[PDB]
Scaffold this motif. Structure first.
Motif, PDB file in Angstrom:
ATOM      1  N   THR A   1     -14.196  48.047  -3.302  1.00  0.00           N
ATOM      2  CA  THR A   1     -15.001  46.882  -3.621  1.00  0.00           C
ATOM      3  C   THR A   1     -16.001  47.262  -4.702  1.00  0.00           C
ATOM      4  O   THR A   1     -16.624  48.326  -4.641  1.00  0.00           O
ATOM      5  CB  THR A   1     -15.732  46.351  -2.381  1.00  0.00           C
ATOM      6  N   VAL A   2     -16.138  46.399  -5.704  1.00  0.00           N
ATOM      7  CA  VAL A   2     -17.141  46.540  -6.752  1.00  0.00           C
ATOM      8  C   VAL A   2     -18.183  45.456  -6.522  1.00  0.00           C
ATOM      9  O   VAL A   2     -17.851  44.267  -6.519  1.00  0.00           O
ATOM     10  CB  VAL A   2     -16.523  46.410  -8.150  1.00  0.00           C
ATOM     11  N   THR A   3     -19.436  45.855  -6.322  1.00  0.00           N
ATOM     12  CA  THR A   3     -20.501  44.913  -5.997  1.00  0.00           C
ATOM     13  C   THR A   3     -21.538  44.927  -7.110  1.00  0.00           C
ATOM     14  O   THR A   3     -21.976  45.997  -7.540  1.00  0.00           O
ATOM     15  CB  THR A   3     -21.165  45.264  -4.665  1.00  0.00           C
ATOM     16  N   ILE A   4     -21.921  43.740  -7.578  1.00  0.00           N
ATOM     17  CA  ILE A   4     -22.809  43.586  -8.721  1.00  0.00           C
ATOM     18  C   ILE A   4     -23.860  42.549  -8.362  1.00  0.00           C
ATOM     19  O   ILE A   4     -23.518  41.449  -7.924  1.00  0.00           O
ATOM     20  CB  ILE A   4     -22.020  43.137  -9.966  1.00  0.00           C
TER      21      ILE A   4
ATOM     22  N   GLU B   1     -30.365  34.385  -9.348  1.00  0.00           N
ATOM     23  CA  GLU B   1     -29.684  35.654  -9.157  1.00  0.00           C
ATOM     24  C   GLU B   1     -28.337  35.409  -8.487  1.00  0.00           C
ATOM     25  O   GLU B   1     -28.195  34.508  -7.655  1.00  0.00           O
ATOM     26  CB  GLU B   1     -30.548  36.582  -8.300  1.00  0.00           C
ATOM     27  N   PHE B   2     -27.339  36.198  -8.865  1.00  0.00           N
ATOM     28  CA  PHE B   2     -26.021  36.125  -8.251  1.00  0.00           C
ATOM     29  C   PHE B   2     -25.653  37.468  -7.637  1.00  0.00           C
ATOM     30  O   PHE B   2     -26.141  38.520  -8.059  1.00  0.00           O
ATOM     31  CB  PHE B   2     -24.939  35.722  -9.263  1.00  0.00           C
ATOM     32  N   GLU B   3     -24.778  37.412  -6.635  1.00  0.00           N
ATOM     33  CA  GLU B   3     -24.131  38.582  -6.056  1.00  0.00           C
ATOM     34  C   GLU B   3     -22.631  38.421  -6.261  1.00  0.00           C
ATOM     35  O   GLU B   3     -22.032  37.453  -5.779  1.00  0.00           O
ATOM     36  CB  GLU B   3     -24.462  38.724  -4.569  1.00  0.00           C
ATOM     37  N   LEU B   4     -22.033  39.351  -6.988  1.00  0.00           N
ATOM     38  CA  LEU B   4     -20.620  39.303  -7.319  1.00  0.00           C
ATOM     39  C   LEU B   4     -19.943  40.459  -6.603  1.00  0.00           C
ATOM     40  O   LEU B   4     -20.432  41.592  -6.662  1.00  0.00           O
ATOM     41  CB  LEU B   4     -20.439  39.397  -8.839  1.00  0.00           C
ATOM     42  N   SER B   5     -18.871  40.167  -5.875  1.00  0.00           N
ATOM     43  CA  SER B   5     -18.059  41.184  -5.224  1.00  0.00           C
ATOM     44  C   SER B   5     -16.657  41.082  -5.803  1.00  0.00           C
ATOM     45  O   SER B   5     -16.130  39.980  -5.976  1.00  0.00           O
ATOM     46  CB  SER B   5     -18.036  40.982  -3.699  1.00  0.00           C
ATOM     47  N   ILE B   6     -16.060  42.214  -6.146  1.00  0.00           N
ATOM     48  CA  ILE B   6     -14.670  42.235  -6.588  1.00  0.00           C
ATOM     49  C   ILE B   6     -13.928  43.183  -5.664  1.00  0.00           C
ATOM     50  O   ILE B   6     -14.194  44.389  -5.668  1.00  0.00           O
ATOM     51  CB  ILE B   6     -14.523  42.654  -8.052  1.00  0.00           C
TER      52      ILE B   6
ATOM     53  N   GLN C   1     -18.706  33.645  -1.533  1.00  0.00           N
ATOM     54  CA  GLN C   1     -17.654  32.638  -1.535  1.00  0.00           C
ATOM     55  C   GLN C   1     -16.499  33.105  -2.413  1.00  0.00           C
ATOM     56  O   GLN C   1     -16.703  33.453  -3.580  1.00  0.00           O
ATOM     57  CB  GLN C   1     -18.218  31.301  -2.034  1.00  0.00           C
ATOM     58  N   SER C   2     -15.283  33.106  -1.864  1.00  0.00           N
ATOM     59  CA  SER C   2     -14.121  33.428  -2.684  1.00  0.00           C
ATOM     60  C   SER C   2     -14.011  32.436  -3.832  1.00  0.00           C
ATOM     61  O   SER C   2     -13.991  31.222  -3.610  1.00  0.00           O
ATOM     62  CB  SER C   2     -12.849  33.396  -1.838  1.00  0.00           C
ATOM     63  N   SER C   3     -13.938  32.954  -5.064  1.00  0.00           N
ATOM     64  CA  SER C   3     -14.065  32.087  -6.229  1.00  0.00           C
ATOM     65  C   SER C   3     -12.976  32.252  -7.286  1.00  0.00           C
ATOM     66  O   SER C   3     -12.694  31.306  -8.024  1.00  0.00           O
ATOM     67  CB  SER C   3     -15.439  32.283  -6.883  1.00  0.00           C
ATOM     68  N   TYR C   4     -12.372  33.438  -7.399  1.00  0.00           N
ATOM     69  CA  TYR C   4     -11.313  33.690  -8.372  1.00  0.00           C
ATOM     70  C   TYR C   4     -10.425  34.780  -7.805  1.00  0.00           C
ATOM     71  O   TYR C   4     -10.906  35.657  -7.091  1.00  0.00           O
ATOM     72  CB  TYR C   4     -11.847  34.159  -9.744  1.00  0.00           C
ATOM     73  N   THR C   5      -9.135  34.746  -8.146  1.00  0.00           N
ATOM     74  CA  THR C   5      -8.296  35.922  -7.928  1.00  0.00           C
ATOM     75  C   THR C   5      -7.407  36.144  -9.148  1.00  0.00           C
ATOM     76  O   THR C   5      -7.165  35.237  -9.951  1.00  0.00           O
ATOM     77  CB  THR C   5      -7.428  35.852  -6.643  1.00  0.00           C
TER      78      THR C   5
ATOM     79  N   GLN D   1      -9.828  40.049  -5.901  1.00  0.00           N
ATOM     80  CA  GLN D   1     -10.476  38.853  -5.388  1.00  0.00           C
ATOM     81  C   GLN D   1     -11.952  38.919  -5.734  1.00  0.00           C
ATOM     82  O   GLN D   1     -12.619  39.905  -5.407  1.00  0.00           O
ATOM     83  CB  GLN D   1     -10.295  38.733  -3.880  1.00  0.00           C
ATOM     84  N   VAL D   2     -12.454  37.873  -6.379  1.00  0.00           N
ATOM     85  CA  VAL D   2     -13.842  37.807  -6.816  1.00  0.00           C
ATOM     86  C   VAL D   2     -14.591  36.873  -5.884  1.00  0.00           C
ATOM     87  O   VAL D   2     -14.257  35.686  -5.793  1.00  0.00           O
ATOM     88  CB  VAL D   2     -13.962  37.327  -8.269  1.00  0.00           C
TER      89      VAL D   2
END
Lengths: 141, 141
Positions: B18-21, B87-92, B106-110, B100-101
């Motif tokens: 997981t990549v967390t930003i 501010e956003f929290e992005l998980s990949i 919230q699942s938003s893109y794959t 999965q982004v």
């Protein structure tokens, strides 16, 4: 680099004013860094834009205005004097009828006034560059 | 903010990584700030990109790969979970068949794998954001 980016400076413009910018893209052109210069009607970033200049390095340049919150007719250029990996010197001259953009000393874009330049109160320089010099000239009546 | 942008970190990915930003756009959405996350095959910025994720905040998201120097088939989404001024929290997440982004949980893109994730050697996060957190997880075999 030395100046903070996004860079915002209060500004006034009239015929004979020159805006000079020295900077460097933060990425190779393959990665399509952008540069944007906006002449705003107020200090607030959401304010109208008398002159919007957006470079996608290596690809295209778009110019426009944003008037009462709405983008107007876009002008698109494929002229690309900017050089991959190099520092650039950008000059924007306020002529009676238009802005003239010089890139590394070469006339490269112009944009006819849609709103009088005296409406400008702020200049913002932002996106994928470092900035070492920014100046607005104030020598003319 | 705290982390330098453009932000580059050497990285390895496999199923379960997981990549967390965590970050913030540097401009209001009216001004169309961008965010870009690229998973590269080498530390060099001109290297191939297994997963390119580019947000134009408030407008659209484009995903693609760059393979042997050439961009492949673009995927364009108008899904826009990001909120103006926030501010956003992005998980990949690296799943067996896709990235999965997640945006703010919230699942938003794959994006289906075009190149094995094991080809990744570097992650770059850049364009018009400040960054307060970046993490790649390394807990799985």
């Amino acid at each position: 680099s030395l100046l903070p980016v996004p860079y915002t400076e209060a500004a006034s413009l009239s015929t004979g004013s020159t805006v000079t910018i020295k900077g460097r893209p933060l990425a190779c052109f393959l990665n399509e860094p952008y540069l944007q210069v906006d002449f705003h009607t107020e200090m607030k970033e959401e304010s109208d834009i008398v002159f919007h200049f957006q470079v996608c390095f290596g690809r295209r340049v778009v110019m426009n205005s944003r008037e009462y919150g709405a983008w107007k007719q876009q002008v698109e250029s494929k002229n690309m004097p900017f050089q991959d990996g190099q520092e650039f010197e950008l000059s924007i001259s306020v002529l009676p009828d238009k802005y003239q953009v010089m890139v590394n000393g070469q006339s490269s874009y112009t944009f006819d006034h849609r709103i009088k330049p005296e409406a400008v109160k702020m200049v913002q320089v932002w996106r994928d560059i470092s900035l070492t010099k920014f100046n607005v000239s104030y020598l003319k009546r």
